[PDB]
Amino acid sequence: SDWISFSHMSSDTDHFPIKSWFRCEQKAASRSYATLGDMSHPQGIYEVRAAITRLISLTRGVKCRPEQMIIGAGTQVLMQLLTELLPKEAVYAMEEPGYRRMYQLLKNAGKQVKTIMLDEKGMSIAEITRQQPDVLVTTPSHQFPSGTIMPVSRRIQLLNWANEEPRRYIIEDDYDSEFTYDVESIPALQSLDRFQNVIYMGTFSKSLLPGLRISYMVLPPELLRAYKQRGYDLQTCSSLTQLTLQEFIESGEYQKHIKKMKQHYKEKRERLITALEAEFSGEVTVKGANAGLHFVTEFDTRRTEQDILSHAAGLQLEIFGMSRFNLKTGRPTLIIGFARLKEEDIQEGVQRLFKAVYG
Amino acid sequence: DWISFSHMSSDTDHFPIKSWFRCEQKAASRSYATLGDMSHPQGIYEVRAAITRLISLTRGVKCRPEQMIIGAGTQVLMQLLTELLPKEAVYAMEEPGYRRMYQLLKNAGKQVKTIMLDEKGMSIAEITRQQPDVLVTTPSHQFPSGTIMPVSRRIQLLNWANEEPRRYIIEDDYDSEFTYDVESIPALQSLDRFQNVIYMGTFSKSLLPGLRISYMVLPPELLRAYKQRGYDLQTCSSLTQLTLQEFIESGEYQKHIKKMKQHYKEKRERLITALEAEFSGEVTVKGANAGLHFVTEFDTRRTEQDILSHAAGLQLEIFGMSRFNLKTGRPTLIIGFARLKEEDIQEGVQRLFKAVYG
Ligand SMILES: Cc1ncc(COP(=O)(O)O)c(/C=N/[C@@H](CCC(=O)O)COc2ccccc2)c1O
Numbered sequence A: 001s002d003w004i005s006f007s008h009m010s011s012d013t014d015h016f017p018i019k020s021w022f023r024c025e026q027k028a029a030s031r032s033y034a035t036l037g038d039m040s041h042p043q044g045i046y047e048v049r050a051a052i053t054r055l056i057s058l059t060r061g062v063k064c065r066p067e068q069m070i071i072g073a074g075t076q077v078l079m080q081l082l083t084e085l086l087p088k089e090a091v092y093a094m095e096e097p098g099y100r101r102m103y104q105l106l107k108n109a110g111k112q113v114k115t116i117m118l119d120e121k122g123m124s125i126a127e128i129t130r131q132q133p134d135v136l137v138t139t140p141s142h143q144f145p146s147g148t149i150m151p152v153s154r155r156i157q158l159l160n161w162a163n164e165e166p167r168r169y170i171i172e173d174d175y176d177s178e179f180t181y182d183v184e185s186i187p188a189l190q191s192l193d194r195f196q197n198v199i200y201m202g203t204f205s206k207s208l209l210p211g212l213r214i215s216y217m218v219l220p221p222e223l224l225r226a227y228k229q230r231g232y233d234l235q236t237c238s239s240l241t242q243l244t245l246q247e248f249i250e251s252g253e254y255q256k257h258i259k260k261m262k263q264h265y266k267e268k269r270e271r272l273i274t275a276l277e278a279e280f281s282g283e284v285t286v287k288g289a290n291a292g293l294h295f296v297t298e299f300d301t302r303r304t305e306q307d308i309l310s311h312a313a314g315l316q317l318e319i320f321g322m323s324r325f326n327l328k329t330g331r332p333t334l335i336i337g338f339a340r341l342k343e344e345d346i347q348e349g350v351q352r353l354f355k356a357v358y359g
Numbered sequence B: 001d002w003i004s005f006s007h008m009s010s011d012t013d014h015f016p017i018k019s020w021f022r023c024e025q026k027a028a029s030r031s032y033a034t035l036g037d038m039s040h041p042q043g044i045y046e047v048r049a050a051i052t053r054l055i056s057l058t059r060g061v062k063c064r065p066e067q068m069i070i071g072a073g074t075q076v077l078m079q080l081l082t083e084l085l086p087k088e089a090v091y092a093m094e095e096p097g098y099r100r101m102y103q104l105l106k107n108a109g110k111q112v113k114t115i116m117l118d119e120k121g122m123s124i125a126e127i128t129r130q131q132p133d134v135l136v137t138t139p140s141h142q143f144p145s146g147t148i149m150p151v152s153r154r155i156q157l158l159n160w161a162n163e164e165p166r167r168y169i170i171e172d173d174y175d176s177e178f179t180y181d182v183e184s185i186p187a188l189q190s191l192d193r194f195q196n197v198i199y200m201g202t203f204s205k206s207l208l209p210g211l212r213i214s215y216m217v218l219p220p221e222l223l224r225a226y227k228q229r230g231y232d233l234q235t236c237s238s239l240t241q242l243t244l245q246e247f248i249e250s251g252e253y254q255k256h257i258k259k260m261k262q263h264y265k266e267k268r269e270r271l272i273t274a275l276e277a278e279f280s281g282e283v284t285v286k287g288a289n290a291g292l293h294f295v296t297e298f299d300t301r302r303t304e305q306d307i308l309s310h311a312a313g314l315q316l317e318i319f320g321m322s323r324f325n326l327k328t329g330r331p332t333l334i335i336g337f338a339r340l341k342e343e344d345i346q347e348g349v350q351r352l353f354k355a356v357y358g
């Protein structure tokens, strides 16, 4: 019962300011108790969309009114709605490797999904023009999983591509954008756009706890119109949660958590990358480590990825391989999530991995 | 100021918010370590078990935790459901019915047949003739009509489902918690032989509408279909699921439902009393045995839509029965009584008289 986690699917419980979250919950519950008897506006409580709208416009340069926002019980519930609002026969394009869960969702709605390989600047604009889709889904802040940060040149190329023809859209999945380490934040695709072909998506999962389940998208007027024409939708976030968040942002706590955690995860990432280069001696390559809460390790070895996982499992080390992110070569890679990982476990973790890779 | 007869509204005053927060803090510490991990996709095991125990006591639903899927309101579970059912399915809903679910189904491509009501719920005459694959029904308190489907028809429906393959029943037990001067009745799922019921429930009505915690129990066949996906993520907040586990397991839920059972019984009376006193036999009350609303038909020249605009003119929030048509010289209105304060009964009852007539 003594595991260590390099899992990317997990967060620190110890570092979340939970006592502050509950304080904001009470402050917020008292001020609006009245209102929790009525069901929330389908898009989300106005003031909550307002609170989120200021923040992302501050932290990422997103241009939007709160009327354009939809909240939010996780991305898949917004992405599902979004497919229902984009044209039924529209052809989707995802990164390769990609957020496989979203691929599976798109396939499960029987949508055609082309897959775009990546280059040094991220999702390839050559492959996009070659494969001629209608809807890109891209992770510019920290490509998931490869880690690549999309430079501004490529952001523009994608944007030019989207207004060459009508009925083309970009879904900017800004997952894991809150932290960026030895570079400055690049502002969002959505900020650079002048023609409103971007659907900006975000989540508080990464910056709070995975267990909270509050995410949001910003819809361009055309698609917002489409949303409003359905009439039947019902909000998926608990109103108390929506309000707790509101209060957690406005009070300044969220902004304070972000600054404290930015520092904490920068130090843990240094510690960990230093540790890895040490007990792997250069047999390792470390990729995509300037943002997010994971990076890639590529190892020099015979052993099949699948066996390293079995061995790692054997040594009580939770860990995942890159093959997981294939939508559709003897250098196996792993994903190293440094969110839950305690600093006492670093050394021991970097040992267990060296034994898992060799034995 | 306003007086609400909205069926879309609820307690606040009569919901133990400090207890809720107490169960939360208790659950929060007992399980703090586990909030760094995402929930099991079907919902936290301990929380499904808690709900699985409760629904067997309160409704006679017999099932394993493993078959339950927790989600953020019925809509999201309903969406999931359609993706698990065959894909070309033909659906069938009560007419009048839950229009939002109608619109979700049309919108999703589905052929959806409407099905008239008789004195004992969803016709079955209609069902057998019109030959659909999937039924959606509301046995405990029809939405909107308020008819309590009795045992005989629950049997009829099961037998319809039982006597041919690939027929399903969606048992939408919305608004079950309360039955006043009558017996509560076993659910279709509990009377089921071959597992062709999908029992769906929700905590929206018994807690606050705000909360967003609902559940559906799947047949093995469909559960194997859910597991073949393997991408879904939970939509309920882990804290909320844990707070709900604590609310049920500590007796505070059971307590709350008893508290509200009495408080809603004596406030349903004080209302009908006042209506049949401020009208006479000019008001017919229908479907007022279960749930948290009834209907009222009014003998009057004014159409439904004039009676609303005049009642809305008097700050009296109210919704009409034509809202629930999927597709008369007697108008009929829905009378939610969950929010309604007692001091406003007599005065709302009056404001409705003047908006019926002039
Ligand atoms: C690329 C990408 N984009 C968006 C999301 C959105 O998450 P949502 O809004 O919260 O529903 C995820 C979640 N991805 C999940 C793993 C995916 C996988 O590898 O199977 C992991 O999510 C979390 C991990 C740690 C802490 C908190 C959350 C995404 O990997």
Ligand SMILES: Cc1ncc(COP(=O)(O)O)c(/C=N/[C@@H](CCC(=O)O)COc2ccccc2)c1O
Pocket: A234, B007, B008, B009, B010, B072, B073, B074, B075, B098, B099, B100, B138, B143, B172, B174, B201, B202, B203, B204, B205, B208, B209, B213, B214
């Ligand atoms: C038939 C039926 N089945 C299920 C549900 C439950 O939806 P869920 O709460 O998201 O799981 C409702 C809620 N229907 C809503 C809309 C009615 C309308 O369209 O006018 C009314 O819901 C609430 C009202 C007060 C307090 C709590 C809920 C349903 O009318």
